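COMPLEX REQUEST
Ligand: TEB
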Amino acid sequence: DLADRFAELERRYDARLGVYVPATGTTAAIEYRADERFAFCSTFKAPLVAAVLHQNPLTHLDKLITYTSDDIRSISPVAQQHVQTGMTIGQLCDAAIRYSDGTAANLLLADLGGPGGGTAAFTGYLRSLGDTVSRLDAEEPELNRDPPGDERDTTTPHAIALVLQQLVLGNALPPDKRALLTDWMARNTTGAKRIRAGFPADWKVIDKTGTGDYGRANDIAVVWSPTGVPYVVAVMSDRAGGGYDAEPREALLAEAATCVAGVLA
Ligand SMILES: *C(=O)[C@@H]([C@@H]1NC(C(=O)O)=C(SC2CN(C3=NCCS3)C2)[C@@H]1C)[C@@H](C)O
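STATUS: Structure written out below.
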């Protein structure tokens, strides 16, 4: 039984686990704690990029954004190198998704604009996709630090799966913008030990991870079977029992994904 397997992993990693996979033609939805709130952490960056793509002409990607030393306030493997020269909107989207660059996300939020430094417009974007659950309240690095239980900066496995489904498989974006988002997630560098680790090599996986305090570890993916059948997989976790400095455990997500892959085969 799937629920028993998920509960077992929770005991193994002293963690809370959330899983959602939307129903398809012939598969029932897979759900474990799927409507419980979990922190977005960096997973919001996938719909953030979609919002920015949607909001602008495609050549907005070529606009150069400048920024300063006091803009580097979180893990930013890419942006840390380019405060001098700036970064284009395209480069920022690339960094935000593929390297989970936090400064890039802050700059993209600022680009989207409006109250809360873009957090309000980001949330508005999700509402336009029918997501009445998720909310973004802060930018990097605060958004990763809300106490366990707090609703600030949270989504649910169910909500984020439905959003991602519209983004990648559905019609939320035009084909050219949709391809841009998909390619970046396809070329993600941060996800090898998560959902990717649970699916066989002949399955295609694109994804965006999230990591944070209180042992938070998330992964949202779209996967394709060797015959081109797509599934959306959202896995989220925290380890509140360990407190603020609790280590995230990627293995938990790899194991969860392995269980899901067994069903989807
Ligand atoms: C978002 O959750 C934070 C950001 N997100 C990100 C992640 O894992 O998703 C980490 S960066 C990172 C460095 N890294 C591994 N190095 C070898 C392969 S992957 C993942 C970080 C916490 C936030 C800063 O935006």
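REMARKS: The chain is about 35% helix and 15% strand. Residues 41-42, 74-75, 100, 102, 105, 140, 189-190, 209-212 surround TEB (CB under 6 Å).
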